[PDB]
Amino acid sequence: ADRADILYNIRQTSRPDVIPTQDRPVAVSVSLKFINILEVNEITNEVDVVFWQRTTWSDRTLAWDSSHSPDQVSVPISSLWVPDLAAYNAISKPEVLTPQLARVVSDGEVLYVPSIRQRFSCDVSGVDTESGATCRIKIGSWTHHSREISVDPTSEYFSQYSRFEILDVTQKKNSVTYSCCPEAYEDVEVSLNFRKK
Amino acid sequence: ADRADILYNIRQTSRPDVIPTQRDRPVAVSVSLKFINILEVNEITNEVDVVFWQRTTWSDRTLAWDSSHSPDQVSVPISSLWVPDLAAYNAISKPEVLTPQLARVVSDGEVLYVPSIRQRFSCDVSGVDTESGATCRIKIGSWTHHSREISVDPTSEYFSQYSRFEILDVTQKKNSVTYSCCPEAYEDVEVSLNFRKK
Amino acid sequence: ADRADILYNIRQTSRPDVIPTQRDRPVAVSVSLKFINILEVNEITNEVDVVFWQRTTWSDRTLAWDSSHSPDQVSVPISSLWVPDLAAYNAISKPEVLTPQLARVVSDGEVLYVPSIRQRFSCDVSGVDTESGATCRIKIGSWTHHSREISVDPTSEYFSQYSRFEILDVTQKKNSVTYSCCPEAYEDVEVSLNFRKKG
Amino acid sequence: ADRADILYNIRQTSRPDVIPTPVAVSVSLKFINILEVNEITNEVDVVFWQRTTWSDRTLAWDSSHSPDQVSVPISSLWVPDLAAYNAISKPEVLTPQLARVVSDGEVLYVPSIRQRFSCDVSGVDTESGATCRIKIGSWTHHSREISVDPTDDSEYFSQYSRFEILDVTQKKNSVTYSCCPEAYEDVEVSLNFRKK
Amino acid sequence: ADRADILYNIRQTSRPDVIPTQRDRPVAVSVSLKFINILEVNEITNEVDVVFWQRTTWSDRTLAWDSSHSPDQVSVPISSLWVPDLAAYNAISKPEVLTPQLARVVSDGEVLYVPSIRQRFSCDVSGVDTESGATCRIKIGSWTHHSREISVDPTEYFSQYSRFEILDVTQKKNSVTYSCCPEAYEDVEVSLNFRKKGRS
Numbered sequence: 001a002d003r004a005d006i007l008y009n010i011r012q013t014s015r016p017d018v019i020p021t022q023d024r025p026v027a028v029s030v031s032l033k034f035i036n037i038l039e040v041n042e043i044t045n046e047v048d049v050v051f052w053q054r055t056t057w058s059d060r061t062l063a064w065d066s067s068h069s070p071d072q073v074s075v076p077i078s079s080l081w082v083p084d085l086a087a088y089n090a091i092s093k094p095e096v097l098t099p100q101l102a103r104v105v106s107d108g109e110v111l112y113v114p115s116i117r118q119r120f121s122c123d124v125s126g127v128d129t130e131s132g133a134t135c136r137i138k139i140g141s142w143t144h145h146s147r148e149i150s151v152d153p154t155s156e157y158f159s160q161y162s163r164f165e166i167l168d169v170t171q172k173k174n175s176v177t178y179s180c181c182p183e184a185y186e187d188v189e190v191s192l193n194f195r196k197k
Numbered sequence: 198a199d200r201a202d203i204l205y206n207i208r209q210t211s212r213p214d215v216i217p218t219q220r221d222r223p224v225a226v227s228v229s230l231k232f233i234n235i236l237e238v239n240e241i242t243n244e245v246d247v248v249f250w251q252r253t254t255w256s257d258r259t260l261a262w263d264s265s266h267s268p269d270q271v272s273v274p275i276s277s278l279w280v281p282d283l284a285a286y287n288a289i290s291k292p293e294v295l296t297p298q299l300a301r302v303v304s305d306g307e308v309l310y311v312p313s314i315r316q317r318f319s320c321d322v323s324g325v326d327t328e329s330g331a332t333c334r335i336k337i338g339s340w341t342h343h344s345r346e347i348s349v350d351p352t353s354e355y356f357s358q359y360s361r362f363e364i365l366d367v368t369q370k371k372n373s374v375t376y377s378c379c380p381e382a383y384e385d386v387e388v389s390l391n392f393r394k395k
Numbered sequence: 396a397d398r399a400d401i402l403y404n405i406r407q408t409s410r411p412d413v414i415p416t417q418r419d420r421p422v423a424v425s426v427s428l429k430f431i432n433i434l435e436v437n438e439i440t441n442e443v444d445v446v447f448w449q450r451t452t453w454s455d456r457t458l459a460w461d462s463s464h465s466p467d468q469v470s471v472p473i474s475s476l477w478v479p480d481l482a483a484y485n486a487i488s489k490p491e492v493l494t495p496q497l498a499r500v501v502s503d504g505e506v507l508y509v510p511s512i513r514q515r516f517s518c519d520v521s522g523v524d525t526e527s528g529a530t531c532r533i534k535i536g537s538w539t540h541h542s543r544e545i546s547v548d549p550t551s552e553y554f555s556q557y558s559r560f561e562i563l564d565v566t567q568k569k570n571s572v573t574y575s576c577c578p579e580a581y582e583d584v585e586v587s588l589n590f591r592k593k594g
Numbered sequence: 595a596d597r598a599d600i601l602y603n604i605r606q607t608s609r610p611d612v613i614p615t616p617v618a619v620s621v622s623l624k625f626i627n628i629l630e631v632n633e634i635t636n637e638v639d640v641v642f643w644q645r646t647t648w649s650d651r652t653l654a655w656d657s658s659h660s661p662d663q664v665s666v667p668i669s670s671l672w673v674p675d676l677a678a679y680n681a682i683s684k685p686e687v688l689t690p691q692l693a694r695v696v697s698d699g700e701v702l703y704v705p706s707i708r709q710r711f712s713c714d715v716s717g718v719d720t721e722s723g724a725t726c727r728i729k730i731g732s733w734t735h736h737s738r739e740i741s742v743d744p745t746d747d748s749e750y751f752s753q754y755s756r757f758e759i760l761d762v763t764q765k766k767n768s769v770t771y772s773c774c775p776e777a778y779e780d781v782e783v784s785l786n787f788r789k790k
Numbered sequence: 791a792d793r794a795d796i797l798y799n800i801r802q803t804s805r806p807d808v809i810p811t812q813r814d815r816p817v818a819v820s821v822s823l824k825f826i827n828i829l830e831v832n833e834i835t836n837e838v839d840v841v842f843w844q845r846t847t848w849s850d851r852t853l854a855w856d857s858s859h860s861p862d863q864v865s866v867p868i869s870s871l872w873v874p875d876l877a878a879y880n881a882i883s884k885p886e887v888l889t890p891q892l893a894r895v896v897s898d899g900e901v902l903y904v905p906s907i908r909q910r911f912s913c914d915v916s917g918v919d920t921e922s923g924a925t926c927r928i929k930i931g932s933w934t935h936h937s938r939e940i941s942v943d944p945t946e947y948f949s950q951y952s953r954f955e956i957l958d959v960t961q962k963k964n965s966v967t968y969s970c971c972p973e974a975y976e977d978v979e980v981s982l983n984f985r986k987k988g989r990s
């Protein structure tokens with residue numbers, strides 16, 4: 001089997017609209033790497049950031065034997081199921097800056113790392129101090145509760161040319177629940193502690 | 198039945214372009230806005246930029262399945278379902294949907310759609326910097342379906358603490374509009390956001 | 396016949412790319428703007444940003460069905476229908492459609508499309524801050540269909556009370572343009588919005 | 595044959611991705627508006643009708659007993675890959691993306707375009723005015739595949755612009771690149787304009 | 791064989807989603823930027839807006855045809871062929887392609903793609919209003935294909951009407967690797983040394 005055969009197989013087997021549960025939730029790993037802080041407004045409490053959203057999960061149906069073939073291919077995400085992640089305090093659409101390609105590994109692991117520019121409503125107070133501001137970004141599945149999707153977290157790539165610098169990034173698991181229903185929604189709370197240089 | 202079987206059944210039965218009227222009764226659409234943010238307010242132009250969750254529910258009993266030994270809910274892309282053609286009458290920008298365009302379908306045939314929307318409105322911003330605050334009225338209804346086809350029924354907890362504004366009161370009242378040409382009435386929800394600068 | 400049957404039949408007979416000329420008659424397109432808002436006015440650059448409902452009606456008799464014992468109207472996405480290729484000649488932005496892109500089809504074959512449009516125009520903004528106000532003229536017609544293929548016919552109630560501007564008068568007059576090349580005439584409606592800044 | 599039959603036939607015969615061979619493409623700009631001029635950055639924002647004609651004989655039909663012209667979406671036709679070499683924004687097509695096809699196989703496409711250009715704005719606030727040169731040609735087809743031929747410059751120009759047109763000149767030209775022997779044909783449109 | 795036949799054959803054999811690796815060799819992608827214009831420079835935010843031609847070439851031997859008695863080159867929409875998934879690592883906007891999205895395919899299987907791109911970068915703008923000027927570094931490589939799948943090789947048209955002038959452009963090969971994995975990603979580092987015209 002050559003690359004074309006693996007890709008043909010993935011396209012004919014992929015169910016983009018069907019969460020690939022093995023009765024277990026799909027374990028989605030999410031890690032933000034901050035690349036840039038572009039605009040900060042201490043009056044409106046708004047930030048414009050660029051981050052790589054490292055996103056991994058498993059779809060065992062996509063797996064193939066790679067003893068005598070490539071163990072990884074690039075696949076357009078429009079061909080694959082993708083977690084329906086959203087940032088709860090986003091105030092703009094995520095602008096994906098990068099090619100919308102995922103990597104599929106022969107064991108069925110899927111890796112997606114879009115570079116995203118997005119605006120958030122978060123605490124910008126203290127940005128011009130030594131201690132800096134702490135902007136909290138909550139990312140979770142919009143429509144899949146904890147029995148369907150679990151979200152697990154895990155300044156190296158931050159631009160030296162930003163007016164801001166990063167003091168600390170903290171990535172903590174959290175859970176939200178609504179008055180209506182017993183369903184809990186898992187999220188990652190990403191705490192970006194940063195300040196003006 | 199697994200998730201794929203429920204979704205294939207929904208795909209084969211759902212007619213995205215056909216309102217699911219039972220007999221000649223209207224489809225009862227529930228609409229509830231939850232305000233998340235007030236981003237830009239202009240007291241001179243009377244324009245406000247808001248973020249809200251538009252909780253939208255209705256019934257398509259043709260989609261129903263037995264969930265005794267199966268999942269009782271799935272996520273479905275809205276392009277596979279009929280969705281109410283709701284619009285805000287006093288919007289001055291396109292709705293920016295911030296969230297994945299998936300609905301939930303429940304085994305009893307309930308459909309639930311909760312987009313997070315950023316949109317700009319023309320409304321009364323006068324008094325925003327006072328104690329009594331401003332009252333901004335948002336009218337949401339079906340653009341093309343009169344009251345015999347769609348009825349719209351209404352029903353601070355999630356408001357960002359980091360907004361420059363705070364919410365005093367949200368009221369959701371049912372209302373109805375009619376045009377000189379025709380006897381048809383269009384139902385809407387009038388959402389009254391009473392808010393002020395902190 | 397139920398709504399699904401009417402919609403199936405419309406999709407089978409509708410030719411979105413084919414003007415529905417009955418005999419070899421022009422398709423009579425009715426156009427009526429209802430101004431909802433005036434957002435930005437620049438008296439120096441002579442530019443206005445407006446919101447209007449473009450009430451647009453025409454006949455496609457091939458879509459007709461018997462509506463004794465069926466619904467006499469349905470909502471249909473405009474991507475399933477032929478739609479007039481109307482353009483504003485002094486527009487300087489693309490029309491931003493604010494509303495769902497659904498038309499109403501009546502069982503006699505009448506089609507009604509009422510998009511809410513935000514668009515920017517180049518027009519006369521002089522006098523906006525006076526009592527007599529400015530008169531901004533918007534020219535709307537078919538871009539590619541001359542008068543033997545499309546005729547365009549015209550016909551403050553919904554204006555936002557919260558605008559900084561107020562409407563004194565709207566006039567809708569039929570007009571016709573012809574180009575040096577060809578004998579073909581293009582019909583338009585000239586919509587004259589007389590408005591001013593409030594006291 | 596009725597309109598539906600002409601359009602059905604165009605869908606069966608048209609190859610949007612195949613140049614209908616050089617194809618002689620006629621290009622003529624009519625300036626409608628000058629919106630923004632910046633003397634410091636040498637940038638202009640203009641609105642123009644790009645009158646574009648060519649022949650695709652494969653589209654032809656007998657019109658003795660049918661319409662001799664139809665409107666066709668450009669996504670159904672081959673269209674010249676014309677670009678402005680000194681554009682600094684994407685062309686914003688303001689108008690419905692329909693061409694006219696004549697029964698002899700002539701195609702006419704007249705988009706109204708808003709676009710920003712890098713060009714000489716020096717003298718704009720003088721009596722002699724500025725001369726802004728806009729170079730339009732095929733991006734990927736050299737002169738053996740596409741030839742570009744030009745055709746009252748102020749007849750359609752908005753009276754409400756802060757600017758006025760003194761002269762529009764449309765001259766044939768050619769570009770060639772260090773790599774290759776191929777020549778690319780262009781029209782150089784010289785817009786002589788000034789502040790009122 | 792006429793143009794229609796060549797294009798039909800390209801559509802029948804081209805796999806837009808499949809990198810055309812020959813044996814187990816990487817696809818050699820040649821990338822060369824020609825700067826056309828510098829539009830907006832912000833010395834406070836360290837942001838530039840530039841227009842450049844991204845000359846992109848590679849080989850897809852599956853596309854090849856006999857051109858002894860037919861055209862040796864055609865224009866093909868990029869949606870009909872595989873295209874390298876190049877991205878600028880310090881881009882802060884989507885690339886805005888200003889030009890028709892057509893590649894040239896040569897009968898030997900050579901593919902040439904030259905989009906005119908407007909894009910905003912985060913890079914060092916300090917010194918732009920000095921004699922030595924600013925050096926803005928743009929890193930371009932494959933987003934998803936490591937060095938065993940794609941290799942990136944580097945290899946006059948600047949508007950005379952820009953308020954900036956170009957002192958030097960240097961194009962150097964480089965390689966990145968991530969803590970997770972052994973895979974290396976090739977890039978080109980393009981160094982644009984430029985400054986404001988007309989300083990005293």
Ligand SMILES: Cc1cccn2c(=O)c(-c3cc(Cl)cc(Cl)c3)c([O-])[n+](Cc3cnc(Cl)s3)c12
Nearest residue numbers: 054101102103111112113933934968969970975
């Ligand atoms: C090539 C590249 C440029 C920038 C960021 N990348 C990354 O961050 C990672 C990465 C991912 C994880 Cl889960 C952990 C770590 Cl430590 C690194 C990575 O593999 N790649 C290549 C890829 C691009 N798209 C996909 Cl899918 S994989 C890059």
Ligand SMILES: Cc1cccn2c(=O)c(-c3cc(Cl)cc(Cl)c3)c([O-])[n+](Cc3cnc(Cl)s3)c12
Nearest residue numbers: 142143178179180185250252300301309310311
């Ligand atoms: C996960 C999440 C984030 C934000 C808002 N949501 C909500 O408001 C509700 C919700 C809906 C109703 Cl009708 C009543 C109540 Cl009390 C709550 C909800 O279920 N969910 C998940 C969903 C997202 N899209 C669909 Cl469809 S369901 C969330």
Ligand SMILES: Cc1cccn2c(=O)c(-c3cc(Cl)cc(Cl)c3)c([O-])[n+](Cc3cnc(Cl)s3)c12
Nearest residue numbers: 340341376377378383448450498499507508509
């Ligand atoms: C519900 C609604 C909100 C706003 C404007 N509308 C209108 O102006 C008219 C209308 C149309 C005409 Cl031809 C004459 C008159 Cl007097 C009124 C109308 O019927 N509707 C509903 C519709 C929306 N889209 C279509 Cl198609 S019909 C509304």
Ligand SMILES: Cc1cccn2c(=O)c(-c3cc(Cl)cc(Cl)c3)c([O-])[n+](Cc3cnc(Cl)s3)c12
Nearest residue numbers: 538539574575576581643645693694702703704
């Ligand atoms: C109706 C209209 C509004 C604006 C500009 N138009 C034009 O300039 C010309 C035109 C074209 C040429 Cl080649 C020479 C001359 Cl002298 C005039 C024209 O025929 N039309 C209609 C058309 C629009 N799109 C197509 Cl295709 S044909 C108009």
Ligand SMILES: Cc1cccn2c(=O)c(-c3cc(Cl)cc(Cl)c3)c([O-])[n+](Cc3cnc(Cl)s3)c12
Nearest residue numbers: 733734771772773778843845893894902903904
């Ligand atoms: C016509 C044109 C306008 C602008 C730029 N172009 C170029 O830069 C080059 C070019 C390419 C290389 Cl690899 C080296 C050199 Cl030295 C020049 C070129 O051939 N062409 C035509 C083409 C445009 N798109 C394709 Cl595909 S071929 C132009």
